[PDB]
Amino acid sequence: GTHSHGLFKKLGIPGPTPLPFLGNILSYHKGFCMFDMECHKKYGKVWGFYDGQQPVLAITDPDMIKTVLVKECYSVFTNRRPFGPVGFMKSAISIAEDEEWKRLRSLLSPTFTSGKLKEMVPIIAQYGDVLVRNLRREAETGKPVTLKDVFGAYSMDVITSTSFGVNIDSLNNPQDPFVENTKKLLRFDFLDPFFLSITVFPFLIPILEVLNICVFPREVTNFLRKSVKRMKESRLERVDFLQLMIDSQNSHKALSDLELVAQSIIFIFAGYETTSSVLSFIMYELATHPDVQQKLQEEIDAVLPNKAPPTYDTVLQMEYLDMVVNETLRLFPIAMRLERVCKKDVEINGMFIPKGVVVMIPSYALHRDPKYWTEPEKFLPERFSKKNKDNIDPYIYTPFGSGPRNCIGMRFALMNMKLALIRVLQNFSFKPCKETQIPLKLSLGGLLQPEKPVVLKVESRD
Ligand code: HEM
Ligand SMILES: CC(=O)[C@H]1CC[C@H]2[C@@H]3CCC4=CC(=O)CC[C@]4(C)[C@H]3CC[C@]12C
8 A cells, every 4th residue: 555655755855755545644742833843843944754655845934835826826736635525515715726726716706895895894893892701701700711612703703794695693592593503613633534434535525425425514514504595585676795795696707606605614614713712812821911912902902992992993003912923823823734735747846746746735844943933832923023024924923824725714813803893892801820831832733722722811901
């Protein structure tokens, strides 16, 4: 079982020595992120490894990265690594490929313009208020609060309302069937037995498609499909993603009906647990660095006096806030990696890359690389002080990727998280208990998350 295993020794590329059938996956005991640093540390600029039989080429040079992510994105590095039995979700933009990806992407971009984002701020700012009362209510009771729980509820509230115009406080209405289903849409752990099996036996993926076994829980997708077509149905009696999409069905185009339901499902999958994880990582950093939390609270109260409500304009005004957000994303880029399938023999910047190879950018590692980042391990928001910008390479730092296929939901996710932080920090402060793990521990699994969940105390500023 060493078919594609000769490739990198042939081209003269360095790397860890692959076992038959398994390749290098046994090196994943430490998790993706620490496998990526070790390889960087030990082979340097470039290296090669095998996910089962699948050869993966890591690159860390910013010029090489740009060529891949930007310059030719369209005729060579268009698609992501196929990853599992996927059924109708093959039409979701993050999963679609080549020409149909390109069609969806430009059908869906107008939905993410800045105009639309502003129509949406009074809708998401509403759940900023909701989150606050939920927070005071169980902070004036004492004591430890689980962030992932309060920020998950907030992330859900904001998705349900901007995706579908469904307005519920999910923390307190925990069983609207709409809360129950959408909550099951978590990010995939690719070190789970199921995905490691799939990686070693990818010839099994088609078999699973046949039995209609899918990585998106068929019971949840059923629910949303029936939900959506009913929403479209009883709407022929503003503003939300569903609506913007229903409109771009009225004149590549003819954004399909089922194509629409797929995008709706995938927007949830993309924004729900991502947004809640980052908010947790940030609020963890703010509790462990009162320096920074105090400075932010002071910045907020100068832009928004008398606990005044955040607007779009006052949000972009706050550059210490922006500093904290980015410095958190550096330390914890929850994507971990960026990947493109190389779909033709190509020659980029002097390195020959044979057709079929997965080219991989180790985002977690580059964000912690001693060259570009002084004291890489410490939470230092001053890195992003507008002084030191332009000392920041947009290809080293890539928490939302880069190029035509970057995070289409970026400015939304950024605006979402900031409005949440502001409303929270206008009202509360967050101290570390010692149910709190200090310092933080990342998971040995395939998701960038804390080992044990983050718990803190929440004091009302009154
Ligand atoms: C803090 C929250 C988020 C982070 C850190 C994040 C990060 C990322 C990253 C790294 C990628 C891959 C980009 C690449 O391959 O270069 C991505 C893709 C994507 N994200 Fe986000 N994301 C977040 C939230 C969201 C939200 C809220 C949405 C939608 C509402 C969203 C929708 C997408 C979509 C649709 C793609 C694939 C786009 C395509 O393939 O054309 N993400 N995200
Ligand atoms: C947590 C996670 O990544 C999810 C995504 C796809 C999910 C799997 C999908 C297929 C599946 C079918 C089963 O009957 C057992 C559970 C499993 C094996 C699921 C376990 C949890 C997985 C691995």
